[PDB]
Amino acid sequence: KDILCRLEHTTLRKVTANTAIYYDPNPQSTVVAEDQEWVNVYYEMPDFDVARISPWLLRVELDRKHMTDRKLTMEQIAEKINAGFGDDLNCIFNDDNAEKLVLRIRIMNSDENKMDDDVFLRCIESNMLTDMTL
């Protein structure tokens, strides 16, 4: 079954439960209340996003059952995003201990400082749910 998991084509659309685009310009004050508990962990010592980051944010929820059934964890997924998009996307994600798997995405500070700052998150999202392969 491990080999099957490595053979079977898996995309984020298979492991994600739901996804939403949130507008929260200041990451220190997440519009999602529950994110603040875990997002504060990362934004306590921000890196590469201290100066600037996209005010828009894409939040993805992943189904634990599909994730565990495919033996997929957030680590390689977050890396696979940066493996696909490069450093274009600041990708930040909650601990495995959380009831729901959450990863937070913003467009890079230099692109904020490629098509648009907001709507291209739909291009990113739909591409991540379609072409991006885990």
Binding site: M115, V119, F120, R122, C123, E125, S126, N127, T130
Partner: protein, 147 residues
């Protein structure tokens, strides 16, 4: 494509005597329903259903350039199978198709455009419900569907 996959599935009307099927919102615009609410009220009867709303979003965005009934008719007429050599001929041609050629059983009188929009809205509503899976697809083999 990034933009294509960002907009996704979108609705086109295959009208008679027209070379390329127009975005469905243009037919409502051509019927005279200008604002998005006037059009969506005929498509979505319960605005509290976000799924239907998200399914119509790309159709509204595609039509956005056409914000006038005369422009939609000129667009329909310039897409006519016999293009009119001038905008006035194109608009009268497009009106004649929408008056007699499209949905004749609903009506052919010059004031039946309101009833045609409701039935066209219902055709879209059925397509949306089918795409959303709330209603099963019609069966060609069902003899109730035969004559």
């Amino acid at each position: 494509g990034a933009k294509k996959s960002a907009i996704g599935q979108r609705i086109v009307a295959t009208l008679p005597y027209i070379k390329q099927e127009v975005p469905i919102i243009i037919v409502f615009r051509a019927l005279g329903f200008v604002s998005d609410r006037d059009i969506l009220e005929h498509i979505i009867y319960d605005f509290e259903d976000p799924e239907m709303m998200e399914m119509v979003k790309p159709s509204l965005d595609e039509a956005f350039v056409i914000q006038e009934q005369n422009v939609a008719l000129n667009f329909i007429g310039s897409r006519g199978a016999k293009p009119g050599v001038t905008k006035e001929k194109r608009i009268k041609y497009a009106k004649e198709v929408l008056q007699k050629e499209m949905l004749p059983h609903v009506g052919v009188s010059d004031f039946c455009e309101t009833k045609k929009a409701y039935f066209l809205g219902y055709m879209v509503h059925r397509l949306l419900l089918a795409a959303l899976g709330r209603r099963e697809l019609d069966d060609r083999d069902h003899y109730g569907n035969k004559r």
